[PDB]
Design a protein around this ligand. Structure first.
Ligand code: CDL
Ligand code: LMN
Ligand code: LMN
Ligand code: T7X
Ligand code: T7X
Ligand code: PSC
Ligand code: 3PE
Ligand code: 3PE
Ligand code: 3PE
Ligand code: 3PE
Lengths: 59, 469, 179, 55, 64, 90, 485
């Protein structure tokens, strides 16, 4: 009756250990430009300076 | 909604008389409360560390910065309560704790400039906000101009802030001269390897950091904190610290830096042994801020330091706020009031405080033991979560210097206790007038947070896990 | 392995950097002072600052490289010995024998605690827990530093601890069994 | 009363009565010494049974 | 449980009302209606914190 | 009632379950105590030999005395930790 | 239900403060209720199970105010084995005796004093329940501010320096304890007194971790490099502070070396037991020798407590079942007999004459015959004179220390001589001679002092006549910490 109630607590603590190791993995994982920077306007391509612009200026 | 308050407020304050100033502050107090209560549901925007950039990659809004602005509003509610409410209805405390006409103007302009640093993405937003908050601290220091010490302090702070603003400007344009860019979003993990941005980014961080009071250049700020009056200095000690450190923790440009580690070791050393043989309570109280800013210079070396930072920030803010409010309350019991702006100076003046209002000493003891880092209190988990990040990341000598610095700093924290629990010859029995209900409730709230805030650690870690990861 | 140190030239380089640091600090004390001070009071009213800088520099780097060359390995003990020599040089300005001994032993202990943690102010990158293999081994391998297992090899226990006290290469039970 | 030494002597007696039940039909004080000679004649642990990875 | 959270946060409100009474050099039960005022306010903070943790757990389980 | 719980080893079990680990722990412990009362039984038998023998206890129970002094370095409490932290044959 | 019990109880407390000025009657009542509760728990305790029987979790996220029935657990665990419950029984029968010990001498601000004493007793009660490393550590240093306030407000002339030392040395060792606890919690990502023998660390990671825990144990069971706060924090404390300290804090660190170090630092511990034997022999001999030249009277019993804890540490670090058991018997019997000695010096001798120098006291038999009876009975009980529990602890710890290393066992066996020299040198000075010309005659020992003394003497004599009475708690934990492969 007491071995089962200790195995329950050990399972509940190993669950927290797995959760902690997971939530540590999750932060060091790299992340998208749409999640790290603003979601709308998801491309990093600037295309900036649009009045006196030259054709051939893109690459 | 700060902009609304400033725009409304200077319009309203130009038409009020000087009889109305205190009531105006009360209005603004309640205004800021309903910006916390009715508008904080915006935390739902920042699920799973979703980050926005606003005004064309000009400002950056994540949940870190949302927490920082919530903290700054809470502290401004406390400080504006300290100005807008009477301590007692004597003819004494009216000639001591008196707001100027334009004080709350400069308060809200400084809170604006402090928010536009933590919310900042580009370097010219950083610059314009740094100078907005710097001119506001110049004028908040100089607004009680009928005082020799505050005038001299405002002049000193002007020149020493001017140098360290020109150093930030030099570092920004120096960064621009090697990269046609303003963002540190430009850096993106590969450029740092093939480019020597070490000298640039470290000179930027240093010019930002010498305004906090880090160790080679600490004495001018300790003199400004001793020379300003007792209500001004609780605001100008806290706000540039949390704004500039919340900028430099969010932007990780000094990771594993040797210079920041040298100056962090030196900061922990000179703050711990610097305030040992000191007899003025604001001096004693400012070297505490020097050490507790050292503990942040430690986290500047870190990658992914947002738990340890935010926990120790609201820790230090509540403890700081409470220990200044307790020595506001001890002015009623001292046998000697000098110096109308700064009525208690010497720390031996609170000597018989256990025999007059012993629960003020219970208050004091709680917040001092939390400054030391005693485990039932909230300062312990701040120091603990800083250590869990220092040791995880290889800073082993820094750890032992942290421990020795905390042990040395415990001496002059306990010196406050050692003075206040002592025998005094003439003790109070019966006093006719009462301390402010509104304003002693704030001190009791700040204590109950410190003592019983370890309860919610696991709740806070779970809410952390969802909104920042 | 290791390769022997240039005690000659590292000590010359250290004497150069100590001379320069003494020049800079004497100029700093000149500029930050009161009274009648001129250009050549920089080396008369200096307070003996260049002696501090150069003596500490020569002593620490000579004793460090000599102890690392005499012991033929590199650890924090060389920082202990070199800090003892630096404390000797800093404690001789105190013309007193017990304070001299106190400077020697306590500076050597502080510098040995420094050199044992890695002799770095900052971090080491790959030695960190963040940038190392951690947690359980997922199957059986040489357990690294920062790693945890459930059971250790008994041969590692016999080689690391010994074969003496209560510790044996076969348990007491199966060494005493009926066939 | 509830301890491992009384329980362990009763368990060791029960184990030798398990293996050799012919001691059952000896009379009462002969049973004592027959149990004792069986304890001297044999291990009756099962400790090397537990260390299977050792063997 | 929600009820234990509410009763405990109301106890924190009772503690801050008691301690603010005793800083004022008042008796304990000086103004007895401030006890229910402070308890309702801190219990409302406990209500907010409980609901935010609940929504947080639901977001964490929706990543299955 | 004289209840006899089942015998578990450290080697068949997963260590991530705690039920089986705690039972293997207590099993190895109680087996050391069984070993111990075997040693005590031989000690009481030997002092019965010595008291019944008188002068010739040198030759009546040479073998009982040798048995007691051979069992004594090996029949005691040894601890489960040393076997559960280390595996021989690995 | 359980909330209504408490706000009934808070109203009980408020009404008896409103009608009675003092608290001490209710504090005594709550202490004896706590006694009866712990003995009812001992009735329902299963000795046939190695596991932890009465478990509860506090400050879980799913229920921050109250108990936890959850799939996931990140709060603070609590629960007992026989090893915990031994020290809990020792703690709980000492808390009413320290509340009773200052029943009349504290006059000025009594309610503060009795609240501080009961609060320290409750914190040390919960120290033995804890099951995480962080849950052990939080309660492990909750004592320190209460000790600082207690030693500073109440005491002799020098209570400022004693209050500073009890914060300083304890905090300074225990910060390095926190360093090692942080390293354990970032390697394992679990702090737990249940699982922690299953995890195996590397040998040189273990030998780094073990140092910081052993430095704190060296500060708190004060071994020779820092054994030094202890005579001044004793010699200048009030009575219940001294009694609670030398009966419970030193045995708490003796409990911590079993609970925290021996399960997951086994392969480290074997490499380091010669260094522990250097330090423990060297704190037996040199402290037992430094007691011979002492002018003060409470300082002698402080140094006595050093020498007995030095005997107990080479029992726990002996890798023997005998040594572990003897260290537990020594800790419990010392926690009985030493607060009785601090009562003799601080209660019956400092309440009457208010000086503590040895040179005033001579010939106490002829006016106080039963005090002198107490002094000689307690002196012999403190030495290692058998049928006392102190000899059972000292004998089994010296035997285990002889097994682990016979030469340091041979030079550690002279503690029987060295512990008796200073104790009998004090006792014959106090009892013998013509009555002192400095002391005027006062009352003989009163009923409450004789009551405390009789309890603390019977409870050593019962352990000394039969040490088996608490083997039923310990026979698991005597096998649990042994690493003999
Ligand atoms: C447990 C905790 C252990 C910690 C204990 C340490 C405290 C010892 C206190 C010693 C003392 O009394 O000094 C008083 C002394 C106070 O001066 P005083 O007023 O002239 O006279 C005091 C007495 O009256 C003079 O009486 P005396 O002369 O008879 O005393 C003899 C001697 C006795 O001191 C002893 O403790 C001797 C112990 C030897 C026994 C060895 C047994 C080993 C087992 O003490 C001294 O006088 C001077 C000791 C030298 C102090 C060294 C300070 C720097 C060491 C690094 C610390 C970090 O301290 C000093 O002046 C030291 C200067 C102030 C600090 C300057 C720091 C400079 C830093 C140098 C570089 C450090 C390198 C760090 C590594 C970084 C790597 C990059
Ligand atoms: C190699 C070591 C050499 C050992 C030498 C002893 C040593 C260091 C002790 C360090 C202990 C190390 C411990 C281990 C590490 C722990 C860190 C201390 O020398 C002490 O020796 C004592 C006993 O001989 C004397 O006490 C005597 O007691 C009574 C009679 O018992 C007498 O009646 C009484 O007159 C004496 O006072 C002291 O006066 C003397 O200071 C060094 O001695 C040398 O240096 C200095 C002090 O650097 C000594 O004193 C200084 O000079 C005085 C004019 O001479 C001036 O007045 C003053 O400038 C200064 O006092 C010198 O004298 C000299 O000897
Ligand atoms: C009051 C109490 C004070 C207690 C201070 C103890 C500090 C002692 C530090 C020990 C420690 C940090 C561990 C700390 C963990 C928590 C510490 C808790 C807080 C402590 C504050 C720093 O180890 C340092 O030790 C120094 C000497 O000891 C060295 O000095 C220098 O020596 C010369 C350099 O070449 C220079 O030439 C000389 O200039 C320097 O001098 C340093 O290089 C070294 O980094 C060990 O970490 C390291 O250990 C190694 C070997 O296992 C681990 O190896 C890896 O793993 C295995 C397979 O993968 C392999 O087996 C192994 O081959 C592999 O490489 C690493 O993973 C790493 O982790
Ligand atoms: C005020 C008002 C404005 C006044 C303006 C007038 C002056 C303008 C100049 C501006 C300077 C402003 C001053 C700035 C403060 C000093 C800044 C400074 O030292 O940072 C140093 C310079 O890193 C150099 O690479 C080292 C740089 C070396 C510089 C050489 C100088 C030569 C002088 C010869 C005579 C930063 O290294 P750091 O600490 O990250 O250290 C590095 C480490 O060395 C690397 O190994 C690692 O890769 C890296 O992770 C990190 O650990
Ligand atoms: C979740 C994050 C954690 C947050 C922690 C919260 C901290 C502060 C929260 C504050 C919310 C406050 C709730 C308290 C409301 C209840 C409360 O005690 O009334 C105030 C304090 O009123 C604040 O001081 C109002 C202070 C407002 C500050 C709002 C800050 C937001 C105390 O009146 P009181 O009875 O002593 O006194 C009055 C008065 O003295 C007499 O003139 C009158 O006869 C009678 O009215 C008498 O009652
Ligand atoms: C109607 C409510 C109106 C809004 C009230 C907001 C006031 C701002 C006050 C700031 C200072 C007071 C401390 C309050 C800490 C709140 C903890 C928290 O929740 O912060 C989170 C975790 O913080 C972290 O990582 C680390 C935070 C560390 C906290 C350490 C102090 C612990 C003890 C004090 C806090 C618990 C007190 C609860 C008392 C019932 C991060 O940000 P969130 O997007 O999830 O915020 C959401 C909060 N909302 C829902 C009320 C808007
Ligand atoms: C090849 C190139 C060769 C280069 C030559 C090496 C140059 C090294 C730099 C020299 C630094 C000189 C330090 C200095 O400026 O002198 C100290 C200065 C004057 O001090 P002083 O007037 O004597 O104060 C009286 C106190 N009673 O006092 C001061 O106020 C200076 C303030 C501190 C200066 C910065 C310190 C940086 C290092 C931090 C400490 C490191 C801690 C490490 C642990
Ligand atoms: C900031 C303020 C700092 C103030 C400092 C005050 C003094 C602090 C206490 C003094 C600490 C001195 C530490 C010196 C350590 C030197 C060292 O690096 O030890 C390394 C040693 C392993 O060296 P290894 O290469 O394996 O073997 C060589 C054998 N000849 O490792 C070992 O052998 C273990 C040595 C243990 C020493 C324990 C000292 C007490 C703790
Ligand atoms: C000085 C500075 C240091 C001081 C630190 C002091 C630490 C104080 C921590 C308080 C711990 C509170 C734990 C209460 C546990 C009471 C309890 O267990 O039951 C009562 C109720 C929960 O009911 P329960 O049956 O446990 O529900 C779960 C069932 N599975 O739970 C409750 O309703 C109890 C509510 C308590 C409210 C107290 C609020 C603070 C008052 C002051
Ligand atoms: C639906 C589920 C959720 C429900 C939660 C909602 C909560 C709403 C708030 C409920 C309000 C109920 C009020 C109960 C608390 C009353 C406190 C009180 O009045 O205690 C007063 C008592 C002294 O009483 P008194 O006789 O006036 O003595 C002074 C005379 N000079 O002084 C004391 O007893 C001191 C009490 C302070 C104790 C603080 C810590 C324990 C909590």
């Amino acid at each position: 009756d007491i071995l089962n109630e200790e195995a329950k607590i050990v399972q509940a603590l190993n669950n927290q250990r797995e959760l902690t190791i997971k939530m540590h993995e999750l932060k060091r994982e790299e992340k998208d430009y749409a999640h790290s920077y603003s979601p709308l306007f998801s491309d990093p391509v600037p295309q900036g300076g649009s009045i006196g612009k030259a054709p051939g200026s893109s690459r | 909604m700060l902009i609304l308050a400033i725009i409304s407020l200077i319009t309203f304050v130009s038409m009020s008389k000087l009889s109305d100033n205190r009531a105006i502050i009360r209005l603004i107090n309640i205004y800021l409360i309903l910006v916390l209560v009715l508008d904080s549901f915006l935390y739902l925007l920042f699920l799973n560390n979703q980050t926005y950039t606003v005004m064309g990659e000009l400002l950056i809004f994540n949940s870190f910065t949302f927490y920082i602005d919530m903290l700054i509003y809470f502290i401004m509610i406390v400080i504006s309560s300290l100005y807008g409410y009477n301590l007692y209805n004597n003819n004494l405390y009216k000639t001591l704790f008196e707001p100027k006409k334009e004080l709350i103007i400069l308060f809200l302009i400084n809170i604006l400039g402090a928010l536009l640093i933590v919310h900042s993405n580009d370097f010219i937003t950083l610059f314009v906000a740094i100078e907005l908050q710097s001119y506001s601290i110049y004028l908040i220091t100089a607004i009680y101009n009928s005082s020799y010490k505050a005038s001299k302090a405002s002049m000193l702070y002007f020149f020493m802030g001017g140098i360290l603003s020109i150093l930030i400007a030099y570092s920004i344009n120096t960064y621009y001269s090697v990269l046609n860019s303003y963002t540190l979003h430009s850096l993106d993990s590969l450029i740092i390897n093939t480019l020597d941005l070490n000298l640039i980014l470290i000179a930027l961080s240093l010019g930002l950091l010498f305004k906090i009071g880090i160790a080679p250049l600490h004495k001018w700020l300790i003199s400004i904190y001793e020379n300003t009056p007792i209500l001004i200095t609780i605001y100008i000690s806290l706000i540039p610290k949390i704004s500039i450190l919340s900028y430099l923790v969010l932007s990780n440009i000094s990771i594993n830096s040797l210079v920041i580690s040298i100056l962090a070791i030196l900061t922990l050393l000179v703050g711990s042994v610097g305030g040992l043989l000191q007899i003025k309570i604001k001096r004693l109280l400012a070297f505490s801020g020097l050490t507790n800013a050292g503990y942040m210079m430690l986290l500047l070396l870190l990658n992914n330091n947002e738990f340890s930072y935010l926990y120790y920030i609201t820790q230090y803010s509540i403890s700081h706020l409470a220990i200044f409010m307790i020595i506001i309350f001890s002015i009623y019991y001292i046998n000697y009031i000098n110096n109308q702006y700064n009525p208690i100076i010497y720390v031996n003046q609170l000597k018989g405080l256990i025999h007059d209002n012993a629960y003020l000493v219970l208050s004091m003891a709680i917040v001092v033991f939390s400054f030391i880092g005693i485990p039932p209190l909230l300062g312990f988990f701040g120091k603990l979560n800083i250590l869990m990040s220092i040791l995880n990341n290889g800073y082993y000598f820094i750890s032992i210097v942290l421990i020795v610095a905390s042990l040395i700093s415990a001496l002059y924290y306990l010196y406050l206790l050692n003075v206040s629990i002592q025998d005094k010859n003439n003790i109070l029995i019966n006093s006719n007038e009462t301390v402010s209900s509104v304003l002693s409730y704030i001190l009791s709230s700040l204590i109950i947070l410190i003592t019983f805030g370890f309860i919610y650690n696991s709740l806070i870690i779970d809410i952390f896990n969802v909104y920042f990861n | 392995h290791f390769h022997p140190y240039n005690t000659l030239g590292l000590a010359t380089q250290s004497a150069m950097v100590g001379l320069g640091a003494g020049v800079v600090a004497a100029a700093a004390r000149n500029s930050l002072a009161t009274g009648p001070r001129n250009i050549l009071t920089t080396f008369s009213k200096s307070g003996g600052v260049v002696t501090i800088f150069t003596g500490a520099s020569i002593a620490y780097v000579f004793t460090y490289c000599s102890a690392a060359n005499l012991r033929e390995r590199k650890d924090g003990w060389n920082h202990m010995w070199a800090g003892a020599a630096t404390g000797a040089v800093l404690g001789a300005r105190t013309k007193l024998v017990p304070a001299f001994i106190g400077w020697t032993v306590l500076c050597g202990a502080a510098c040995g605690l420094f050199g044992w943690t890695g002799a770095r102010f900052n971090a080491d990158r790959k030695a960190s827990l963040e940038q190392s293999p951690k947690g359980f081994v997922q199957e059986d391998a040489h357990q690294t530093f920062w790693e945890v297992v459930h059971r250790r090899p008994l041969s590692l226990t016999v080689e690391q601890l010994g074969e003496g006290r209560g510790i044996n290469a076969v348990p007491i039970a199966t060494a005493t069994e009926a066939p | 009363r509830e301890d491992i030494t009384f329980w362990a002597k009763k368990e060791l007696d029960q184990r030798v009565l398990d293996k050799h039940p012919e001691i059952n039909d000896a009379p009462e004080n002969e049973r004592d010494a027959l149990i004792v000679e069986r304890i001297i004649a044999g291990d009756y642990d099962k400790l090397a049974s537990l260390q299977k990875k050792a063997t | 449980a929600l009820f234990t959270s509410l009763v405990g946060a109301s106890g924190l409100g009772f503690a801050t009302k008691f301690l603010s009474n005793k800083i004022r050099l008042k008796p304990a039960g000086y103004y007895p209606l401030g006890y229910v005022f402070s308890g309702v306010a801190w219990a409302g903070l406990g209500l907010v914190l409980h609901n935010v943790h609940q929504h947080s757990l639901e977001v964490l389980e929706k990543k299955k | 009632e004289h209840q006899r719980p089942e015998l578990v080893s450290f080697d068949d079990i997963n260590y991530n379950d705690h039920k089986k680990v705690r039972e293997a722990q207590e099993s190895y412990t109680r087996e050391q105590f069984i070993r111990l009362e075997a040693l005590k039984t031989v000690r009481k038998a030997l002092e019965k030999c010595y008291e019944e023998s008188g002068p010739n206890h040198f030759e009546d129970c040479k073998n009982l005395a040798e048995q007691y002094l051979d069992m004594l370095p090996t029949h005691r409490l040894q601890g489960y930790l040393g076997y559960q932290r280390n595996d021989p044959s690995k | 239900f359980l909330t209504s019990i408490l706000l009934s109880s808070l109203y009980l407390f408020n009404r008896i403060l409103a009608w009675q000025g003092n608290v001490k009657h209710f504090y005594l009542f709550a202490s004896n209720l706590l006694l009866l509760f712990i003995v009812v728990l001992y009735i329902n305790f299963n000795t046939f199970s190695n596991s932890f029987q009465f478990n509860f979790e506090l400050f879980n996220s799913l229920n921050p105010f109250g108990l936890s029935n959850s799939d996931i657990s990140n709060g603070l665990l609590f629960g007992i084995d026989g090893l915990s419950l031994t020290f809990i029984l020792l703690t709980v029968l000492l808390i009413p005796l320290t509340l009773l010990g200052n029943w009349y001498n504290i006059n000025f601000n009594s309610n503060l004093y009795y609240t501080l004493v009961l609060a320290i007793g409750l914190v040390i009660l919960l120290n033995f329940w804890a099951l995480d490393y962080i849950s052990f550590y939080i309660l492990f240093e909750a004592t320190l501010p209460l000790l600082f306030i207690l030693i500073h407000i109440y005491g002799s002339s020098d209570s400022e320096r004693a209050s500073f030392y009890v914060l300083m040395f304890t905090l300074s060792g225990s910060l390095f304890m926190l360093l090692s606890i942080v390293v354990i919690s970032i390697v394992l990502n679990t702090t737990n007194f249940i699982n922690h023998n299953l995890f195996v660390l590397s040998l040189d990671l273990q030998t780094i971790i073990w140092l910081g825990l052993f430095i704190a144990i060296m500060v708190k069971t004060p071994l020779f490099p820092i054994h030094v706060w202890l005579p001044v924090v004793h010699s200048e404390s009030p009575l219940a502070g001294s009694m609670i300290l030398a009966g419970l804090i030193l045995k708490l660190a003796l409990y911590a070396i079993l609970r925290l170090l021996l399960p997951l630092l086994c392969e480290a511990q074997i490499l380091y037991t010669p260094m522990i034997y250097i330090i423990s022999l060297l704190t037996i001999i040199l402290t037992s020798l430094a007691t011979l030249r002492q002018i003060d009277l409470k300082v002698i019993i402080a140094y006595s407590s050093i020498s007995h804890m030095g005997i107990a540490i080479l029992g726990v670090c002996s890798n023997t079942s005998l040594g572990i058991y003897g260290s537990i018997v020594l800790g419990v019997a010392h926690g009985f007999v030493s607060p009785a000695l601090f009562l003799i010096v601080g209660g019956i001798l400092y309440d009457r004459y208010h000086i503590r120098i040895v040179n005033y006291y001579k010939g106490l038999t002829t006016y106080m015959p039963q005090l002198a009876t107490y002094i000689i009975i307690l002196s012999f009980a403190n030495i290692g004179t058998p049928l006392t529990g102190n000899f059972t602890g000292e004998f089994l710890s010296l035997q285990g220390g002889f097994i682990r290393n016979p030469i340091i066992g041979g030079i550690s066996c002279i503690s029987v001589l060295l512990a008796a020299i200073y104790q009998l040198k004090l006792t014959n000075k106090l009892t013998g001679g013509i009555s002192s010309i400095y002391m005027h005659r006062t009352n003989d020992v009163t009923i409450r002092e004789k009551f405390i003394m009789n309890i603390l003497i019977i409870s050593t004599l019962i352990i000394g006549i039969c040490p088996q009475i608490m083997y039923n708690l310990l026979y698991w934990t005597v096998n649990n910490y042994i690493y003999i492969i």
